[PDB]
Amino acid sequence: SMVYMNIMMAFTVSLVGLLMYRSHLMSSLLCLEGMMLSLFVMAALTILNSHFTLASMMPIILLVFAACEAALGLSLLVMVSNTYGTDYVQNLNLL
């Protein structure tokens, strides 16, 4: 309507952020929590304006799962450095 357009514009920048890769792999895991942050604000405004009360529980569940993927991806980042030296998008073997 008005406030939604700004946070949708913040989503599009973070969308590019997940599709852009430069040197380190750490940027993606910031953008994974970044994109979930933008979705959380969008969920909070939609539910509260046209009141739900029952469905206001749903973004709290979403916020739990927001870091569920982020914790697993950040733990995968650990094992790549052990096999190599430093985590790099530039450094990959598979074809």
Binding site: M2, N49, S50, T53
Partner: protein, 89 residues
Amino acid sequence: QKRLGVDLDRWMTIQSAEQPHKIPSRCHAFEKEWIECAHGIGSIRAEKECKIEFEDFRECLLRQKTMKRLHAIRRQREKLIKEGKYTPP
């Protein structure tokens, strides 16, 4: 659902249900109409009979029909500067 649940239910999904305590929805007046129109199979599949009630439902959450109306009033008040001004408040 590809496979539905029997006996045990895990609903509380659709709008205008049994409330958390007693507090009702802001769009509950328009929510009641959509359930009453689309309870039959030949309404949403046809998507012509419930066209009137869906457009009224679009007015509730987005407020886009009221947004363009209130935009015209606020523009005309700003356009009329130093000629024809009224301020009852």
